[PDB]
């Protein structure tokens, strides 16, 4: 939970809260957020639209280290 708090915040902001399970399953912990790639999110079973929204968020939000 505490290792996933910032990721949960991003998903809530994107309207993608359903994929928090996918982040946990993939061990997409908060240190991974600045490093996410399309390949990693696809391996976590996130569909194309949500991947685009997540990747754009991490490239734009200065909240993501």
């Amino acid at each position: 939970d505490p290792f996933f708090t910032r990721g949960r915040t991003m998903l809530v902001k994107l309207g993608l809260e359903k994929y928090e399970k996918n982040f946990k399953k993939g061990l997409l912990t908060d240190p991974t957020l600045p490093l996410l790639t399309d390949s990693a999110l696809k391996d976590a079973n996130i569909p194309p639209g949500p991947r685009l929204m997540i990747l754009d968020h991490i490239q734009r939000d200065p909240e993501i280290k």
Side-chain angles (χ1 to χ4, degrees), residues 2-64:
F3 266 101
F4 293 98
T5 49
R6 293 182 183 174
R8 207 153 37 240
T9 291
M10 153 183 88
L11 294 172
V12 172
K13 185 166 334 202
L14 294 174
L16 298 175
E17 310 178 30
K18 82 175 278 152
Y19 302 106
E20 181 48 40
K21 142 175 91 73
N22 307 60
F23 273 57
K24 289 182 154 223
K25 189 64 174 185
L27 301 182
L28 301 181
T29 52
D30 289 349
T32 75
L33 298 176
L35 315 179
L36 297 175
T37 61
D38 193 62
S39 178
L41 293 171
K42 211 198 280 193
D43 280 334
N45 303 306
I46 295 159
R51 292 196 309 260
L52 287 171
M53 291 167 79
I54 290 161
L55 291 167
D56 174 71
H57 184 88
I58 64 148
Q59 285 141 48
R60 295 174 160 290
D61 218 291
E63 279 193 42
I64 310 286

